[PDB]
Each structure stands twice: as structure tokens, then as C-alpha cells.
Amino acid sequence: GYTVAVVGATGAVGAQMIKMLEESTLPIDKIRYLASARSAGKSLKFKDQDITIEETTETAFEGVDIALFSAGSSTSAKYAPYAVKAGVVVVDNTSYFRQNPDVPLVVPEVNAHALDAHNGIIACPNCSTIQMMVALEPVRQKWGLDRIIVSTYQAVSGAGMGAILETQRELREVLNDGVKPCDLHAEILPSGGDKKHYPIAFNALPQIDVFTDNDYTYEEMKMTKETKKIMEDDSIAVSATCVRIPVLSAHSESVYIETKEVAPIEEVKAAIAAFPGAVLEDDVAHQIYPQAINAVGSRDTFVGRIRKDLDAEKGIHMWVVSDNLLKGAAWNSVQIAETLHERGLVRPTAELKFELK
Amino acid sequence: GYTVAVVGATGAVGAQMIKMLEESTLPIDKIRYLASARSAGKSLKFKDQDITIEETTETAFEGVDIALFSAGSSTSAKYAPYAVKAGVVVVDNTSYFRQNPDVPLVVPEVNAHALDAHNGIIACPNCSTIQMMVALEPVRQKWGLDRIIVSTYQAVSGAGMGAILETQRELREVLNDGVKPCDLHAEILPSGGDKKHYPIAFNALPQIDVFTDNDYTYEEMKMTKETKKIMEDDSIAVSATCVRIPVLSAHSESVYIETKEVAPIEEVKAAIAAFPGAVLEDDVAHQIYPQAINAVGSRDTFVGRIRKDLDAEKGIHMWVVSDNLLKGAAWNSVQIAETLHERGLVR
Amino acid sequence: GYTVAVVGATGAVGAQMIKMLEESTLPIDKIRYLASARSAGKSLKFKDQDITIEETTETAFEGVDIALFSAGSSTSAKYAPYAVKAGVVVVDNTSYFRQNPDVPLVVPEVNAHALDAHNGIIACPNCSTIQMMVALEPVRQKWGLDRIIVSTYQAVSGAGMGAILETQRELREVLNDGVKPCDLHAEILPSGGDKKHYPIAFNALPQIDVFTDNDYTYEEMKMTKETKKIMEDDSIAVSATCVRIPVLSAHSESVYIETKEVAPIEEVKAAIAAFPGAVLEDDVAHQIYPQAINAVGSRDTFVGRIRKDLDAEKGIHMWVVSDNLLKGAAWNSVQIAETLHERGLVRPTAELKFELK
Amino acid sequence: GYTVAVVGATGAVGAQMIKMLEESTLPIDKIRYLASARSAGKSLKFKDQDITIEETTETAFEGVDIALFSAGSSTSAKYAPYAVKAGVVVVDNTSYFRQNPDVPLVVPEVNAHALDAHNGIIACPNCSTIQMMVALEPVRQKWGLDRIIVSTYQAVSGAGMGAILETQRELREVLNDGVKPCDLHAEILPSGGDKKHYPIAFNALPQIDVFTDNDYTYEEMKMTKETKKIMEDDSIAVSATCVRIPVLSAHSESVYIETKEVAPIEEVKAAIAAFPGAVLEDDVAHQIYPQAINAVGSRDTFVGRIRKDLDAEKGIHMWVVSDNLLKGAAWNSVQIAETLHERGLVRPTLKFELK
Ligand SMILES: NC(=O)c1ccc[n+]([C@@H]2O[C@H](COP(=O)([O-])OP(=O)(O)OC[C@H]3O[C@@H](n4cnc5c(N)ncnc54)[C@H](OP(=O)(O)O)[C@@H]3O)[C@@H](O)[C@H]2O)c1
Ligand SMILES: NC(=O)c1ccc[n+]([C@@H]2O[C@H](COP(=O)([O-])OP(=O)(O)OC[C@H]3O[C@@H](n4cnc5c(N)ncnc54)[C@H](OP(=O)(O)O)[C@@H]3O)[C@@H](O)[C@H]2O)c1
Ligand SMILES: NC(=O)c1ccc[n+]([C@@H]2O[C@H](COP(=O)([O-])OP(=O)(O)OC[C@H]3O[C@@H](n4cnc5c(N)ncnc54)[C@H](OP(=O)(O)O)[C@@H]3O)[C@@H](O)[C@H]2O)c1
Ligand SMILES: NC(=O)c1ccc[n+]([C@@H]2O[C@H](COP(=O)([O-])OP(=O)(O)OC[C@H]3O[C@@H](n4cnc5c(N)ncnc54)[C@H](OP(=O)(O)O)[C@@H]3O)[C@@H](O)[C@H]2O)c1
Ligand SMILES: *C(=O)C[C@@H](N)C(=O)O
Ligand SMILES: *C(=O)C[C@@H](N)C(=O)O
Ligand SMILES: *C(=O)C[C@@H](N)C(=O)O
Ligand SMILES: *C(=O)C[C@@H](N)C(=O)O
């Protein structure tokens, strides 16, 4: 089978990428771990095999059949076009190539068909978008979607290994040393690139990624724009509010929709339940609903609290939870890689459509 | 038959060189694709056969009969001498050998005769100049040429594959992300070699290549000098303004000429139509004139908007369009290759 | 103060007429917006104030001091003579009246004295012509002008809002939906009212306006004849080739001239630099020259690439760029209006010189 | 007059801080020498008077008017906020507060005016930066400054007293015992806190301080950032290479600039000569140029090798030399204190957290 490279092997997503590949249906002959200079030379396991980490360079992709990128937009912007030139099929986790019409933006259970026409890079959508698409696609299939209003409850792991560590030490300082939450010193959250940083311990930060010109943040607009693209329908109205909360792993979403035809609630539960990747967890009589802590370690997307709006005939509320590192990232990526292998789509692209620097 | 080498087969001209060879009257026994170390190993089709890209090296040219260079004047300056020594005939599609008196500069329809005295290197002319020569030769032949004034509307594909991709994503950022054109970041155009780069998205850049000592660019000076050499007449006045526009493929030219004798338009139209490589597309009553999007894919040079100057007795304006990767490059080069074979000049 | 009417307020030019008036030296007591029945009854902003759009009719001009017209030649032909009978002073943007010797054809920096004999209508010249006049008058003043040869690179905004939208949609269709440029369906360009329409995305269309009996189009003949009228010199030989290119706003011109006496290039640059409305952008050492994207939003006309012909003693080449919506149309009209005000020329005309249709 | 405290009185800069204060115009009623616990109790002289060194504590700044901190970033990090709370005006010779917008970064000849908005802490810039600013400001004033390229030739004194003694013993090991320079053992240079140490004896080490994420060192990036701050212009292009050479004292710089307009050399020379704090030492006919060994003990910045670039219209080369312990540190810091006194700015101010 394949030589498979993981770019960003030492990170939060990369650790999970390693785990998803170890259990993958993909024929792997050789596995390669790529990071920056700081991890080069260091060792990391694949099953029992002992794998030395390689520095990522323009010439690192010779002999590689598939590369999963999860090292940040800059790394992908820099080294993915070279991997393509080399003959790799790239599955990128970052947001860099997502809006490029030459690049499929794929959730396998929803739009696997878009993989066929790939040009050597396939993008794994934003994590909050992925779980929402899993939850919503069986609903659109039957009754259509007019609009989505979403408020998200995002875990810190989506911002990376340092974010996780920053949160754990902040909480430890409050709970163990008696420090007040607003006397904490943050270096990373709400966004690593932005000017100011704020404590997350016992907080809810209504900022993920930086702000755009319309006063929505980038995370908020990614949900809007990625939704329209994955679902292939620009007429679906989408607005989002994305909040960081003190959760390590698993994103949660309060999702409001309006359908095009009225959609009886028990039929909505049945539709979601019967969609691949989606698990109905909805039994309010035994207080059953999706929970972040129960979603961690699972590849499934969990859906509950499903109930019609109190006023809008065609309006429905729900609660959607998934592990942001698995379905939101690594599992979706490994699922994409497996689907490409299955459909004969793991080969070089003759025509190069991504400029180099 | 022949062992043919395509040097720079992965770029914009290279891709079309493959296409033109696939369809040529050249007897090709063996074909080789040469490029940089970054392309070595990778595979490209010649018809149904898979061909593995080799690195351009010193001893790559052993056993090659013909080499078509389309890989940067730098690469022609380095390797063409070794190719020639290895006993190759080189058709160079770069600007390096263009003002060497020992190197013919050839448009087969205009100055085929110049090939007879070749010393192993034949230079394919500048694209903008090629199409102007095809259009103008049948006019010179009959009424002479005193002067040419030309303004060009040049497609981004002339500056390479990466200019294409720069142009497409710039456009996408304006249309898709709502970016202001003056707020875009450019890395290639107007010219890779120059210090500053400017957006081409929704713009017109009056710079192709770098500036010369006299405030005309190298592109403008080529059209002047290469017109004199190809037509073997230094007495023809040629002055040019070269502009990059957001067209992906095909160059367009607003051409102004003064002939030595009054050329009636009906006859000028007829001389162009009859000239090989030139197609008359001129019927203003049904809005017929050459268009850049119509010329892509075609080996012909299309001429129209032909009309007399409103005041100068011997003045004529026209619109000349041609695919810059084809007749302006790969096709002219392959046509040179085919003529060399037919004249027995490949040895 | 004046009552000021903008006819065709809803269009590309009308919209900039609004911008220019908000920033104008004109004493404005009342602003009115007029358009067709399509838009009559809708609303639009003048500064922070809501203005109801009115239908343009024969009786719609009572009380108006100055009326700016930018609504097509037919709307000018039908309603400008009625505004003049009402006592209005008309600044027309269209081609309809430009060649009537009773109508001044004015670029304020060049021939403002022609405004004194006005008879109620003052014509704003063709946009391509305006910019060329700003560039060339300083030259003519010192060394004379024997001939002009011009090739234009014209932006689609010149052909109106619909053309702008056509151009945007075709480009999106090619870049996003993988449509070949020849398989695109045009409806407006090159010429709204001509028999066939062609795509403009990645094209250069050597037609602007319909063709005339001599095989030049009207756009090309406008440049020829408006030049002669504006400069008041029928002996200047002018030929134009006018092309539409995929640019939203700002026209660019490759301009060749032959002067009467030899004009030294360093002196030519200084004469152009010192002319009002004209800005020298000429430093090839640093790749400085006029660019359409930089001229958008500016009321200045930009001149560079200035260089003598390689063979013709008195031949000079240059590159002229201006916003066709501003100096080419709206700003020129507002400048005319402001100068009419300055010279006490805003008042009714006794004797009616334009036919009522 | 003032109660002045010198914090880090026993180091290389601290020792020149004493010399500069003795000859200062600052009125001094009382002086205090502060350092760590291992210096406490020992004595140093101020003029012909003996002074007992005290431990630098979070409370020791009661009654002090002016404090000159030359004891490392973490000492200024710890105790300068407490000094400020205590009503002292601090002149900080270290790099801690340098890019803090509430802290003016001052070379008095260039941007004395920035002193007026101080919040109790004034930062003395990097030594390489100071001399470069003295030499270039008079050119900027007249013909503008577009870009700077600099390669430095830096003395070991810049890395503190231990660096001097390391350099000395390494050289004696080579010269007296015949030790291969590449066989020498080093513990401080190129940078003490970094992992690996290298001999400086008969060497040129292209590393000063630790490396940053852009592969330039912090020293190099100090010159870049601090040039922008001092001249209050982010548009000036600055790129540096900082090198340690076997010189005990005085930094030297090869300096390339491109101005905004053409700056005649005879005029450039005249401008530098007339500029306070800068001496023109430039007579190639008699081989006169700034020299490191001539510069030691002097408060002036010496400039020579002034000549136009062989190609670039607006390019100029020059050689700048100054004592890095004087104008590069202790003199600059006493010049700030004097200017603060002259301007009536020595008074109690509160924008820095207490650790
Ligand atoms: N977190 C999620 O749930 C999630 C979901 C979907 C998409 N993503 C995207 O995945 C990207 C990063 O993943 P993360 O959040 O897991 O970050 P992270 O935990 O900080 O991990 C960063 C990884 O990037 C590598 N890296 C950094 N610079 C590099 C370089 N120059 N060359 C090669 N590798 C480099 C690091 O390697 P070293 O060991 O050398 O530092 C490390 O392996 C982001 O763009 C994010 O938007 C994340
Ligand atoms: N474009 C036109 O219409 C046109 C017309 C007339 C003349 N030309 C001239 O023809 C040349 C290239 O044409 P293009 O537009 O096709 O350029 P392009 O798309 O940028 O491609 C350049 C080609 O040159 C090869 N190459 C570059 N450097 C090389 C090296 N050091 N060693 C070996 N091969 C190297 C590249 O190989 P890799 O892929 O491995 O890098 C690639 O195949 C230029 O000199 C251009 O000015 C172009
Ligand atoms: N485009 C340029 O650069 C430029 C430059 C100088 C002069 N001009 C002249 O300005 C005129 C049109 O401006 P544009 O190019 O900006 O066109 P546009 O965007 O298509 O809009 C045309 C305007 O004309 C109005 N209109 C159409 N029919 C009308 C009628 N029967 N009665 C009243 N108003 C009517 C439209 O109003 P509704 O919204 O009610 O349909 C709209 O306000 C043309 O004559 C053009 O030559 C244009
Ligand atoms: N060294 C230079 O050439 C130079 C040049 C320009 C700017 N600077 C800045 O000034 C600082 C050091 O310069 P230097 O020449 O004085 O270095 P040095 O000769 O190594 O001496 C360091 C001084 O800091 C004092 N110190 C260290 N730890 C202390 C603590 N915990 N509490 C109180 N005092 C402490 C030392 O006191 P003890 O005697 O008790 O150890 C000593 O007086 C550095 O931060 C540097 O950035 C230095
Ligand atoms: C999912 O893509 C993770 C990231 N968007 C975040 O939560 O910050
Ligand atoms: C024609 O030869 C292509 C190239 N000269 C260009 O367009 O710049
Ligand atoms: C200027 O008047 C605009 C219009 N004539 C055009 O560009 O077509
Ligand atoms: C001056 O600031 C001294 C120090 N920067 C050094 O030489 O390292």
C-alpha cells in the first residue's frame, strides 16, 4: 500500500492522527512523522515500530503517497503545494485551502462525491462545522434547510497543545494557589495571533480566531461559508456565535434551524439516528442528552435535546456534541484518506494548481 | 526518426510543446522530458506512453537530435552550448540568443530562409512580435512598411504558470473575500526579476519585463529590435507600449502602421486573408473581430478592425490576436522543428 | 442656496454624483433624486438624510436651480430641454448634446471660458476624452499638438451598473464553477444596444459603442471630435482604438502624440506635473507609473511612462489613467456646477434653444 | 539634592556608573550601592568616602530619589516596580522594559523630549543601538533614512565582568601554554543562559544573546526594534548581524545606510561633526578612523570611513565606535538622570505590576 506522512505529528491533532491511523483500514507500508526543527531527531511510536521525527522541508515528500497536514495554516501554505508537485495527495486539516474552488471541502458522510475531482489537496473542514453538518444533513435531505442559528461551546484543545496546558495551569493556580481568575496571566487564548490574551479559567470568551471587518470573528464566518460550500447551497442562511469555555476536549453546539417543510420531531430523531456518523442521544425522561465528557474518545457525533421552537412552525432546536480532535479533525481526515483509497483516488495530479514561493 | 528533448516540459510553454509534438509531422522515435530537480521522477503523457521527467544536466543531451528549450534564458545560457556540442539542433524559446548575429530568429512564414545558415541554435522570437509579423508581412510585401506603433494587451500566461495562479487567486480574493484590489499582495507580476510586484486583478500594468536605459522596457525593445532582424530591415520605425491585462491566455495588439504606398483596405484585408498563419476575422456589420478567448487553442493569428487612419494618407489601424503559448511559442517552435526536418537541417 | 437635482441617481455615475455633492463647495438648500419609474418611490441617502427618488417627467423640474443628468442619451434628449424651459441649468453627462455648438463642452481645467456663453445646457465630455485632455493640454500650451493616436484600456463601469454585475458574475462562473470563457452567456457587453453580446471575463473586446459608417465605433469617434471641440482646433488629427478589458473602474490609455515644436521630455513631465487635475507618476527607476487600481477613488488624472518616440523627432508616448466615474463623469460634472456657481452662471436662460420632443 | 542608588554597583556597568556620577552635575546628598547578598557588607568608594553595599530588597528604596539599575533583567523585573511604588525615578539599563509603551527608550541627544511623559521608568537602550543612533540622527535630520544594514564588532565587556576574565584567561592559555583555541573550554560566551559555550580567543562569534524564532538573535532584533522606537519610525528598514570579537572594551560597527535624498559626503561629514555626542575622526590621508582602543574611557561616539556606495545612488558606508560601558551604558544612564534633573522630572509618579 502507501507511504503516509503525518505533518504535525507531535501536536494535539497529530497525536490523534497517529491513533486513527493505527486503527485505519488503510494499507500502510511506511509511516513518516513530520514536525519542525524542535521535534526533529525525537522518537514517536506507530503501533510498536519506533519512528524518528523528521523536519518538514520542500524535499521531505519524495515517495509519499498521502500526507495528512495538521501543523497550522502557515505550514500548509508553505509545504502542501510542494507535496502536490512531488505527487502526494494532501488531506489538510487547516483553514488555508478551504475556500479554494480547486479543493474539495469534505465530510465523507455528506459530500464524498466532491473527492472525485480533487487536484491533490482535500481540506478537512472546521471542527464545529463538521459536527453540525453530520447533525443537519439528514434533516436537509428530508425537509430542506432555510436557516441555521448556532451558538458554540468550544473546548480549548481546538486551539492546540499549548492552549490545553495554559488552561490546566490557570485552573491549578486558581484552585490550588488561591489566585483570582482575572489576576491570571494568559499567553495564548482567546487567539494566539491576536494582540491581547485573557484567562479562560472560570470564563467564557466570546472570541475564537481574530475578528473580521463585519464584527463576526473568523471562526464564526468559517461556519457560515463552509456550511454553504459542503452542502452546495448558497441560499442557506447561517450566523454563528463562537465561545471558548473551560472544557479540554469536545465541542458542544446550541443549534437552531428552520426547515423548508415542517418536520415532525420524532421523524427528526429517526432521521438523525439513521444517518451514518450520528448518534441519537435523546431521552429527557432519563436525562439523556449529549455531553462533552462522554463524547471524548468517540468517532461519533452525538445529538439530542431535539424539540420544536415554541413559536416558529418550522423551527427546531437541538444540542450537538463531538470530539473536536476526532470527527472534528483526525478522524475526518483519516476517513477522507480511506475513502480516497477506496475510490481509487490516491495518485499524483498532473496539473499543478497551487503556486509555490 | 528523431530523439526529441523538451526542456522545461512542466511549465506553461512546455505543456503546449507536448501537445504540438503529439500532432506534428516530425518523425519521433524517442521523446524525453527535461526539467528541474523538483520535477525529476514525476511522469507525463506523450499520447498514451508514460514519460519520466529527467533533471536537466550536462550529459542529458547525449543521443538527442532536437531539443526545444522552454526553461528560462538562464537554463538556455547554461545547457544549450552542451546540447550543441553533443550534436543537437536547439530551438530556443527564450530571449538569451535573440541578438546574436550567428543565431537565426525565425517565423517560418516570414523568414524561413534564415534557417539554412544555422550553427546549431535557432531562436524562436518574442510572442508579441511573432503575431505582429504574421499580420504585417503580407502588407509589407505589397505596399511596404515605413513605421509601426503598437500597444499590446498581454495575457498573464506569457509570464509563466505561476503568474496564471497568482492571477486566479487575486481575482478570487477580490470576488470571494471582498478584498480591495490595491490591498492585494503580489509576488510575480509585473516581472519576477524586478524589485516590486503589483496586483494584476482588475488592473492594467504598463510593465512587461524590466526597464531599459531609454525608459522603454525590454519587452518594448524586443518588439522593435526583433521586428528589424526578422524583416531584415533596420529602416522600419518601431515603437511600442506593452501592457499586462487580466486575460489568462492570448495576446491582443492595437497595431498602427504607415506603409510606403497607399494600401487600399479591401486589398489589405485580402492579402492578410491569403497569408499563411493569418486569419481575417473582420466583419463589423455582424460584430466580427478577433477576441482573445476565441484564439486560445488555435495556431492561427487573427486580424481585424482593419481601417484607414482618419488623417494620415498611408496610415492603417488593426487589432491582432494570438495564443501566446501556441503561435507565440510552442507552435512557432514546433513549426521551426518541422521546417528543419523538411529542409534536411537536423544533423 | 440651490435646489439640486440628480437625474439617474441610482446608477453607477449617479452614485458617485452623490458622493461628490456631499463633498462639494456648492451651497445646497435642497437635494432631489430622479430616476425612472423602476426606482421612483424608493429611497436613498444624501449624507445622513433619507431622500425619496422621483420619476423623471416634463413637469419634475419646477424650482430646481441645477440638474445633473446621468441617465442615458434618450433621457437627456427627452427631459433636458424641459428642465431648461423650467429655468434649470443642466450639466449633461451623455453624448446627446455634446456636438451642439450652442452647448459648451467643458473640462474646467482646459476650457472653463466656454461656460460663459452657455444656454442652459453644458456637456460633460466622454470619460476617455476628459482624461486625455487633462494630460495633453499642458503639452499643447507649450509645444502644440499636431496629432493623437490612442489605444484605450476601458473599465466595465463605463457601461453602467448592469455591465459591472455581468462582469462580476462571469468571472465568478469561470473561477468558481469551472465554466470556459467561450461558454459564457453575455447580455450587455460590448454594447448594450447592439445585436450581439460577448463575454468580457478574460477577454479584450475591441468594441465600445456601436460601429459607425467609417468602421470606427462611436466611442472612437467621440474621442476624435470632442478633442477638436474641447481644444477648439479642428486641425489636430485624432484616431482612437477603444477596447473593453476586465477592470471594474478606471480607464487607462496608451497615448502617442506628435507635437508642433520638439517637446523635451523632462520639460513635458514638469508641464504635466504643474497642470491642475494632472498628477505626474513617472519614476521608472522605482517602477512608478499610473495604475487603474490606484486611481480608483481619486479625482486626479495620472500620467507616466513618458518617453520620446524612438524615431519620430516630435513623437511622445505616455500612459494616462483616471477614474471614469469621477473625473470621467461625476466629478467633472460637479466641478462644472461649482465653477458655474463661482462665475455667477447659475440662472435661467431667456430664449429656449433646444427642441421639445 | 538627591538620594541616588546604583543597583548592581559591583558589575562592569555599575563600576562605570560610579565614575560617571562622581563627575556628574547631578546634585547628590546621599549615595547608595545595592547588589545581591554576597556583595552586602563589602565597601566601595564614592570619591574619598566609603560606602557599604546593601542587599537589593523589595523595601530598600524608601527615601531614594533616583535609582540606576544595572543588574540584569530579572533584578529590574523584580525591584524596579517596588522602587516606582516607593516614589523613585528609575533609569533601567537592562532590556526588560524596553518595548513597553509606558516606558520611554531614550538617547538624550536624539529623543530627550520623550522623557516628559515618563511613568517612573526610563529605559537605556542597547549599547550597539545608542552609538548607531548618535552617528545617524544628524544624517536623518537632513537627508532622511530609508534603510540600515549593520555588522557589529562587539567587545566582551558587553557580556559583563566574567566575560572579560574568561576572555583574558583563554588568551593566556593560548599565548602562555600553547593551547589550541579550538581546544579551549568556555563557560560564559557567546551567551551565559544559552546551552553551549564557545571560545572567543582568536575567534569571531556570530551570536550575541539567544536566537529568536526568525533566526536572528535578540541582540540583532534589539537594534531593529529599538532603532524604530528611538527614531519614532517603524518604516525604517533595519537588519543587523551582531558579532563578538576578542576586544575587551568598545563596540565597533560597519554601518550601511540608504538615505531618502542624496547626501553629499562633505556635508554628511559636517553634519556628524556638528552633532552633540559625536566626533568626526575621518582623515584617510593620515589614516585617521575610529579605533576601539582609542575610544575606551571616552563619552563620545566616533565616526569615520565615510564614503558613498560604489553603486547605490543614496548609499553610504561608515565606521562607528564607542565605549560600550560609557555612552553605551553608564554615561547614557547618567545623561538621562541629569536631563531628568534639568527638566524638573525627578519626582514621584503607577503602571507596572509588583511581582
Ligand atoms: N485543534 C483542533 O481540534 C483542530 C481541528 C481542525 C483543524 N485544526 C487546525 O490544525 C492546525 C494545528 O493543530 P493543533 O491545534 O493541534 O496545534 P498544536 O497542538 O499547537 O500543534 C502544532 C503542530 O504543528 C507543528 N508545527 C509547528 N510549526 C511547524 C512548522 N514550521 N513545520 C512543521 N510543523 C510545525 C508542531 O510541531 P513541533 O513539535 O515542531 O512544534 C506540532 O506538531 C491549526 O491550523 C488548526 O486550525 C485544529
Ligand atoms: N509563456 C509564454 O507565452 C512564453 C513565450 C515566449 C518565450 N517564453 C519563455 O520561455 C521560458 C519558460 O516558459 P513558461 O511560460 O512555460 O515558464 P513556466 O511556466 O514558469 O515554467 C518554467 C519551466 O522551466 C523549467 N525550469 C526552470 N528552471 C529550470 C532549471 N534551473 N533547470 C531545468 N529546468 C528549469 C521548469 O521546470 P520545473 O517545473 O521542475 O521547475 C519549468 O518546466 C521563459 O524564458 C519564458 O520567458 C514564454
Ligand atoms: N459609465 C461611465 O463611466 C460614464 C461616464 C460619463 C457619462 N456617462 C453617462 O451616464 C449615463 C448613465 O449612467 P451609468 O453608466 O452609471 O448607467 P447605469 O448604472 O446603468 O444607470 C443608469 C441610470 O439611468 C436611469 N434611467 C434609465 N432610464 C431612465 C428614464 N427613462 N428616466 C429617468 N432615468 C432613467 C436609471 O434609473 P433606474 O434605476 O430608475 O432604472 C439609472 O439611474 C449614460 O448616458 C452614460 O453615457 C457614463
Ligand atoms: N555588562 C555590560 O557590558 C552591559 C552593557 C550594557 C547594558 N548592560 C545591562 O546591565 C546588566 C549587567 O551589567 P554589568 O556589567 O553590571 O554585569 P556584571 O558585571 O556581570 O554584574 C552584574 C551585576 O548585577 C548584580 N546582581 C546580580 N544578581 C543580583 C541580585 N539578585 N540582586 C541584586 N543585584 C544582583 C551583581 O551583583 P553581585 O556582585 O552581588 O553579583 C552585579 O553587580 C545586564 O542586564 C545588561 O543588560 C550590561
Ligand atoms: C476546529 O477546527 C478547532 C478550531 N476551529 C477551534 O476550536 O479553535
Ligand atoms: C512572449 O514571448 C511572452 C512574454 N514575453 C511575455 O508575455 O511577457
Ligand atoms: C465614459 O464616458 C464611459 C463610457 N463612454 C465607456 O466607457 O464606454
Ligand atoms: C550593550 O547593550 C551590551 C550588550 N548588548 C552586548 O554587547 O551584548
PDB file of C-alpha atoms and ligand atoms in Angstrom, chain D residues 7-14 34-40 42 56 69-73 75 79 93-95 98 125 127 156-162 324-325 328-329, ligand 4:
ATOM      1  CA  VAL D   7      21.728  48.878  41.732  1.00  0.00           C
ATOM      2  CA  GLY D   8      24.391  46.441  40.542  1.00  0.00           C
ATOM      3  CA  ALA D   9      27.209  48.652  41.760  1.00  0.00           C
ATOM      4  CA  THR D  10      29.759  45.794  41.567  1.00  0.00           C
ATOM      5  CA  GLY D  11      29.474  44.852  37.886  1.00  0.00           C
ATOM      6  CA  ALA D  12      31.148  46.187  34.740  1.00  0.00           C
ATOM      7  CA  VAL D  13      28.426  48.833  34.066  1.00  0.00           C
ATOM      8  CA  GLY D  14      27.852  49.537  37.794  1.00  0.00           C
ATOM      9  CA  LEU D  34      22.899  47.916  46.064  1.00  0.00           C
ATOM     10  CA  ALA D  35      23.587  44.385  44.788  1.00  0.00           C
ATOM     11  CA  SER D  36      22.935  40.783  45.900  1.00  0.00           C
ATOM     12  CA  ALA D  37      23.514  39.235  49.340  1.00  0.00           C
ATOM     13  CA  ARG D  38      27.098  38.205  48.506  1.00  0.00           C
ATOM     14  CA  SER D  39      28.124  41.836  47.936  1.00  0.00           C
ATOM     15  CA  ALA D  40      26.275  43.110  51.048  1.00  0.00           C
ATOM     16  CA  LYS D  42      31.587  44.959  51.448  1.00  0.00           C
ATOM     17  CA  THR D  56      18.664  44.752  46.955  1.00  0.00           C
ATOM     18  CA  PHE D  69      19.523  49.714  37.626  1.00  0.00           C
ATOM     19  CA  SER D  70      22.376  47.764  36.031  1.00  0.00           C
ATOM     20  CA  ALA D  71      21.828  44.262  37.495  1.00  0.00           C
ATOM     21  CA  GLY D  72      20.174  42.081  34.798  1.00  0.00           C
ATOM     22  CA  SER D  73      16.571  41.959  33.527  1.00  0.00           C
ATOM     23  CA  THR D  75      16.608  42.188  39.028  1.00  0.00           C
ATOM     24  CA  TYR D  79      12.663  45.521  42.235  1.00  0.00           C
ATOM     25  CA  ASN D  93      19.995  49.851  31.808  1.00  0.00           C
ATOM     26  CA  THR D  94      18.616  46.348  31.091  1.00  0.00           C
ATOM     27  CA  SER D  95      16.254  45.095  28.369  1.00  0.00           C
ATOM     28  CA  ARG D  98      12.434  48.449  26.517  1.00  0.00           C
ATOM     29  CA  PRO D 125      18.703  51.318  25.013  1.00  0.00           C
ATOM     30  CA  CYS D 127      24.677  49.771  23.643  1.00  0.00           C
ATOM     31  CA  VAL D 156      33.403  41.153  25.571  1.00  0.00           C
ATOM     32  CA  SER D 157      32.739  43.763  28.313  1.00  0.00           C
ATOM     33  CA  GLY D 158      29.187  43.860  26.926  1.00  0.00           C
ATOM     34  CA  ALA D 159      28.642  40.366  28.391  1.00  0.00           C
ATOM     35  CA  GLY D 160      29.698  41.508  31.874  1.00  0.00           C
ATOM     36  CA  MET D 161      32.750  41.213  34.123  1.00  0.00           C
ATOM     37  CA  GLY D 162      33.024  37.367  33.968  1.00  0.00           C
ATOM     38  CA  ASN D 324      30.002  50.260  25.397  1.00  0.00           C
ATOM     39  CA  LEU D 325      30.295  50.808  29.164  1.00  0.00           C
ATOM     40  CA  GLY D 328      26.570  52.541  25.533  1.00  0.00           C
ATOM     41  CA  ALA D 329      25.503  52.285  29.161  1.00  0.00           C
TER      42      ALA D 329
HETATM   43  N1  LIG E   4      27.779  44.172  31.012  1.00  0.00           N
HETATM   44  C1  LIG E   4      27.753  45.101  30.063  1.00  0.00           C
HETATM   45  O1  LIG E   4      28.730  45.412  29.393  1.00  0.00           O
HETATM   46  C2  LIG E   4      26.408  45.791  29.833  1.00  0.00           C
HETATM   47  C3  LIG E   4      26.248  46.786  28.873  1.00  0.00           C
HETATM   48  C4  LIG E   4      25.080  47.500  28.580  1.00  0.00           C
HETATM   49  C5  LIG E   4      23.836  47.119  29.416  1.00  0.00           C
HETATM   50  N2  LIG E   4      24.076  46.056  30.436  1.00  0.00           N
HETATM   51  C6  LIG E   4      22.962  45.604  31.296  1.00  0.00           C
HETATM   52  O2  LIG E   4      23.322  45.653  32.710  1.00  0.00           O
HETATM   53  C7  LIG E   4      23.182  44.325  33.304  1.00  0.00           C
HETATM   54  C8  LIG E   4      24.540  43.798  33.877  1.00  0.00           C
HETATM   55  O3  LIG E   4      25.686  44.647  33.553  1.00  0.00           O
HETATM   56  P1  LIG E   4      27.094  44.532  34.396  1.00  0.00           P
HETATM   57  O4  LIG E   4      28.231  44.910  33.523  1.00  0.00           O
HETATM   58  O5  LIG E   4      26.908  45.233  35.706  1.00  0.00           O
HETATM   59  O6  LIG E   4      27.171  42.856  34.589  1.00  0.00           O
HETATM   60  P2  LIG E   4      28.167  42.042  35.611  1.00  0.00           P
HETATM   61  O7  LIG E   4      29.488  42.706  35.586  1.00  0.00           O
HETATM   62  O8  LIG E   4      28.078  40.567  35.388  1.00  0.00           O
HETATM   63  O9  LIG E   4      27.472  42.364  37.031  1.00  0.00           O
HETATM   64  C9  LIG E   4      26.079  42.125  37.285  1.00  0.00           C
HETATM   65  C10 LIG E   4      25.597  42.980  38.472  1.00  0.00           C
HETATM   66  O10 LIG E   4      24.227  42.589  38.806  1.00  0.00           O
HETATM   67  C11 LIG E   4      24.164  42.404  40.231  1.00  0.00           C
HETATM   68  N3  LIG E   4      23.193  41.366  40.613  1.00  0.00           N
HETATM   69  C12 LIG E   4      23.113  40.128  40.107  1.00  0.00           C
HETATM   70  N4  LIG E   4      22.123  39.468  40.710  1.00  0.00           N
HETATM   71  C13 LIG E   4      21.573  40.289  41.599  1.00  0.00           C
HETATM   72  C14 LIG E   4      20.528  40.164  42.502  1.00  0.00           C
HETATM   73  N5  LIG E   4      19.855  39.029  42.592  1.00  0.00           N
HETATM   74  N6  LIG E   4      20.222  41.200  43.291  1.00  0.00           N
HETATM   75  C15 LIG E   4      20.890  42.345  43.206  1.00  0.00           C
HETATM   76  N7  LIG E   4      21.894  42.501  42.354  1.00  0.00           N
HETATM   77  C16 LIG E   4      22.256  41.496  41.543  1.00  0.00           C
HETATM   78  C17 LIG E   4      25.532  41.843  40.581  1.00  0.00           C
HETATM   79  O11 LIG E   4      25.780  41.966  41.996  1.00  0.00           O
HETATM   80  P3  LIG E   4      26.824  40.972  42.738  1.00  0.00           P
HETATM   81  O12 LIG E   4      28.217  41.492  42.728  1.00  0.00           O
HETATM   82  O13 LIG E   4      26.251  40.696  44.210  1.00  0.00           O
HETATM   83  O14 LIG E   4      26.734  39.581  41.958  1.00  0.00           O
HETATM   84  C18 LIG E   4      26.437  42.730  39.736  1.00  0.00           C
HETATM   85  O15 LIG E   4      26.674  43.972  40.389  1.00  0.00           O
HETATM   86  C19 LIG E   4      22.629  43.395  32.214  1.00  0.00           C
HETATM   87  O16 LIG E   4      21.235  43.195  32.419  1.00  0.00           O
HETATM   88  C20 LIG E   4      22.849  44.139  30.897  1.00  0.00           C
HETATM   89  O17 LIG E   4      21.741  44.002  30.001  1.00  0.00           O
HETATM   90  C21 LIG E   4      25.322  45.436  30.607  1.00  0.00           C
END
